[PDB]
Design a protein around this nucleic acid. Structure first.
Lengths: 104, 127, 60, 80, 152, 202, 97
RNA sequence: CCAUCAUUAAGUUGGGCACUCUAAGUUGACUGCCGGUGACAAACCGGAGGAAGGUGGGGAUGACGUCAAAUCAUCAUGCCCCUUAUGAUUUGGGCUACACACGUGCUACAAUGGACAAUACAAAGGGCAGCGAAACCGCGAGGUCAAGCAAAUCCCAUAAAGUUGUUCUCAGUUCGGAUUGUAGUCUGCAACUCGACUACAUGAAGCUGGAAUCGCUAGUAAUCGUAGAUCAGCAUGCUACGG
């Protein structure tokens, strides 16, 4: 709905919280965020065509659109083996020690 | 040579079948310019290769074997090396020192773990 | 405490993921090769007992 | 470390027709986190087993879509 | 590490195109693992920019740079301990600063990207007549130790 | 004393390999049938003091190959012990008919298994120099290759061994294809370990 | 493939790979037998611990290769090149055909 | 395993093309050896025969000696105690922990390349229903069960990467790929504990990461990995060695 114009659009969804392994895997890899869009890249009908990917739940910081908060009810199990992002600093029993150190 | 002539370096055998005539790029009959866009390892061995004029004297026709992709090639030069004593003895003056006369300079110096060479101490714990 | 807790895989044992498939005559319960059921270095020691031939170096 | 066999208890699932249709006990010789969680695990009780005793941890109605394996707190981490 | 000491070092070899190792050590700055797939192209989009921006090839106007990089004459001193004791000294190609490859003028690769493809072509031609620029090949290895006279 | 335990010395000319084993199936049980039987004769041969190791399994028609050439213990009288093992060692091996034996020619000259011949020279600790340890002085100078002798078997509770030397001499002392082996045994020090390290030189 | 009647290095496989030239010419056949091949080895995978103490290495050699020779062309009356008794009992003569 | 035999399927089959590649052991090797500034006080260098060079060069074992240093929670035990358990045993749990001070195996911000397929190849080492090829079952997993002959070959494999060419303009950009319903997909009552598929609904950072740390000078890293033994259903670890 508010994808960036004037340049390539495959930086639209790659690094957004809430959506991961559909950001650059289902919304850009499976679906279409344009990869060769100039300032004039058919922003007359294509712009409105790709707005049905913004209509599910709570998307990309757009928290009424696509993705996020279906795990809300799931939050209350008193459980461990989904904390990797459900609780996304993974404190799911693994290391934040000396050398377990790459991502978050 | 129609036999297992000494074409062999850097993990290569060669059935150097010495058909008189064309000496060309007979490494599976292809090119190396952007297939080896490095484009540095083929023509550099001209002091052994091109000096005898075995480009219209004999083919190599090497049967290749061994060496992971960055390892094998350049062995047609040794395929024509032992040919040069029977293909074109035009530059046999420099092969006693280094060339086609005796052997090959560089090859698979099998992995010696814990050292690289000659007094080093690169950026491991040391320098 | 003498003899036969090592005899688990000697008898029919349930889980050999512990892997008491070992060598002969020393201490190793768990995590080496497979042959004579309780040891680690016996794969060479007992292998040099006429099972498999010899071994050399020559002079670097 | 496999992903085989969605497994309700298969011996206590024989009793879970009466312990999840009804409620399961509160502090008993149970484990209260392996047997998978689903939105039909609503309003029941269960006892998590560290070794001190089986301390009650509930199985409420919001329990649908999460997983298990600190089924006893292996660290009690606090440490430093 | 004394009792033992220190002895000279290694160097490089030319290429059959121009018979020049000045281009060789510059490729050896980038000679990835035998896989020089376009490290070759990065060298040929760095070294050609002195032979192109300056009309003459590797041996005449590039010689304005490559007469002055790893040495015949450099700055060096002898076993004198902790004092100044400085004088100009002639040298060999053992430890290296003023005829073929060393220190300052020629950072080919130091402009406003995080690239190698086009960055080497950016900051390259400053060693046209041996005039500074940025740290790869010579300039600042000539002007060391000639300062104090009165309160020295 | 920060020393490792050797087995093979100079293998490639002098040191050899007696591997003639063909019991190919059942590496868990048929291998057991010919290796665990080696855990058997440590007691019966009465201070065997034997030569070397020569094991051989004759194409799974296994006749047991351990010589221990001190006669009588393995001979009997015209096939008494051997023929008895023909029926007894059917539990050891498949047949084990007429187990063999050799004659030992100055067994203290054999580099490896001399260690028993000298562990039974001082383990008694009672007249342990003349009645038993006569043979350190008998087996001295038959010209063995590895010239190294030591004894450590329960002498006051010793946790190390002994050596003897003098001094002079000149030679080109480098030789690269000799033969020698280890020795280590089961005496009780009672507080801090020492399994007796024991060799002699012929 | 890689000769071994039970003799492995060339102070004994100068007997085995040298009698491959001869024992392959024993009895009934017209074989295409002897094919001196590359070698094979065998590593003694061991270390020296029960809890902790391990990690040492040195200079190996090893060979034991039991053969496959291509002796599959028999003649049951003209004893030429297959089936002479060649030490099968003590020597583990495993010559695949 | 063709270079031409022809009946090139190259049944590499008739013979044996197949001297060679094939699959090439032996012994060529040993400055065995000349001229020297070698002054002899010599061999190595200069050479020069060697397939190999000056041991051609490496891949298990290390003294006179054993600190008995992890391990009586391995066995042959000195010794006891437990002899209705401290033996235990089962499975109920987890034992793969979970702020960790430390750590390591595998990582992107590339344009020698991010995805795609190929260029093609494999040494390896495996097998008794084998690999799972082959169709197969896939962008995601990869079963299906025979295949091949118990395997000189067979399967592995299209291996792959490197490279073809870009995708992008070197950002934080298909960069790149964990997470919960996932299938339980490969799967045995019992995985969701005690994997991941890159795949969908599920961001994990990151500007070449700082000084430092700590491996790599030749088929090894880079390029990436293919087989094998633990894996009673769990590998990235490990070992064999590859284009």
């Amino acid at each position: 709905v508010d994808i960036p114009r004037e340049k390539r659009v495959v930086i639209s969804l790659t690094y957004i919280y809430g959506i991961g392994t559909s950001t650059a895997q289902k919304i850009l890899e499976e679906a279409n965020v344009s990869a060769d869009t100039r300032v004039k890249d058919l922003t007359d009908d294509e712009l409105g065509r790709i707005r049905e990917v913004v209509d599910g739940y709570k998307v990309e910081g757009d928290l009424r659109r696509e993705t996020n908060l279906n795990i809300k009810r799931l939050m209350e199990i008193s459980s461990y083996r989904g904390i990797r992002h459900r609780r996304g600093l993974p404190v799911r029993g693994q290391k934040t020690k000396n050398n377990a150190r790459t991502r978050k | 040579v129609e036999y297992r002539g000494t074409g062999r370096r850097k993990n290569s055998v060669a059935r150097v079948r010495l058909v008189p005539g064309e000496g060309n790029i007979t490494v599976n009959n292809r090119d190396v310019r952007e297939y080896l866009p490095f484009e540095s390892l083929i023509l550099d061995l001209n002091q052994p290769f091109d000096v005898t004029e075995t480009k219209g004297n004999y083919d190599v026709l090497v049967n290749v074997h061994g060496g992971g992709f960055t390892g094998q090639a350049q062995a047609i030069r040794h395929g024509i090396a032992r040919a040069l004593l029977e293909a074109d003895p035009e530059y046999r003056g420099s092969l006693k020192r280094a060339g086609l006369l005796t052997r090959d300079p560089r090859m698979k110096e099998r992995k010696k773990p814990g050292l690289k060479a000659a007094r080093r101490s690169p950026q491991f714990s040391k320098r | 405490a003498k003899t036969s807790m090592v005899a688990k895989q000697q008898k029919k044992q349930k889980y050999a993921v512990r892997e008491y498939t070992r060598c002969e005559r020393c201490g190793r319960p768990h995590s080496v090769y497979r042959k004579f059921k309780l040891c680690r270095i016996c794969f060479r020691e007992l292998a040099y007992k006429g099972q498999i031939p010899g071994v050399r170096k020559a002079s670097w | 470390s496999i992903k085989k066999g969605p497994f309700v208890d298969e011996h206590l699932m024989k009793k879970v027709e009466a312990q999840e249709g009804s409620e399961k006990k509160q502090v008993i010789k149970t484990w209260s986190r392996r047997s998978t969680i689903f939105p039909n695990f609503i309003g029941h009780t269960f006892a998590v087993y560290d070794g001190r005793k089986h301390v009650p941890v509930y199985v409420t109605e919001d329990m649908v879509g999460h997983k298990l394996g600190e089924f006893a707190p292996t660290r009690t981490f606090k440490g430093h | 590490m004394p009792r033992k000491g220190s002895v000279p070092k290694r160097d490089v070899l030319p290429d059959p195109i121009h018979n020049s190792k000045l281009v060789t050590k510059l490729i050896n700055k980038i000679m990835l693992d035998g896989k020089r797939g376009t490290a070759q192209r990065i060298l040929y989009s760095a070294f050609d920019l002195v032979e192109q921006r300056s009309g003459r090839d590797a041996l005449e106007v590039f010689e304005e740079a490559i007469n002055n990089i790893m040495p015949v004459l450099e700055v060096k001193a002898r076993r004198v301990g902790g004092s100044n004791y400085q004088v100009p000294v002639e040298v060999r190609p053992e430890r290296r600063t003023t005829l073929g490859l060393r220190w300052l003028v020629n950072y080919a690769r130091l402009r406003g990207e995080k690239t190698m493809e086009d960055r080497l072509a950016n900051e390259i031609l400053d060693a046209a007549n041996n005039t500074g620029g940025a740290v790869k090949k010579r300039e600042d290895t000539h002007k060391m130790a000639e300062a104090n006279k009165a309160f020295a | 004393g920060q020393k490792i335990n050797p087995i093979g010395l100079r293998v490639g000319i002098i040191r050899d390999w007696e591997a003639k084993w063909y019991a190919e199936k059942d590496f868990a049980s048929l291998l057991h049938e010919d290796l665990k039987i080696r855990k058997f004769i440590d007691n019966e041969l009465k201070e065997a003091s034997v030569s070397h190791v020569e094991i051989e399994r004759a194409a799974n028609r296994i006749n047991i190959a351990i010589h221990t050439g001190k006669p009588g213990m393995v001979i009997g009288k015209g096939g008494s012990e051997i023929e008895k093992l023909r029926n007894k060692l059917n539990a050891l091996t498949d047949k084990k008919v007429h187990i063999n034996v050799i004659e030992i020619k100055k067994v203290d000259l054999d580099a490896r298994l001399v260690a028993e011949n000298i562990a039974r020279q001082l383990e008694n600790r009672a007249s342990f120099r003349r009645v038993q340890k006569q043979a350190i002085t008998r087996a001295m100078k038959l010209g063995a290759k590895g010239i190294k002798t030591q004894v450590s078997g329960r002498l006051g509770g010793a946790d190390i061994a002994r050596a003897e030397q003098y001094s002079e001499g000149t030679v080109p002392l480098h030789t690269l294809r000799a033969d020698i082996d280890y020795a280590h045994a089961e005496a009780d020090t009672t507080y801090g370990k020492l399994g007796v390290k024991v060799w002699i030189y012929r | 493939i890689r000769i071994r009647l039970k003799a492995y290095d060339h102070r004994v496989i100068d007997q085995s790979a040298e009698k491959i030239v001869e024992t392959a010419k024993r009895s009934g056949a017209d074989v295409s037998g002897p094919i001196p091949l590359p070698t094979e080895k065998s590593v003694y995978t061991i270390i020296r611990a029960v809890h902790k103490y391990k990690d040492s290495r040195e200079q190996f050699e090893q060979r034991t290769h039991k053969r496959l020779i291509d002796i599959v062309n028999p003649t049951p009356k003209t004893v030429d090149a297959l089936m002479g008794l060649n030490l099968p009992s003590g020597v583990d003569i495993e010559i695949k055909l």
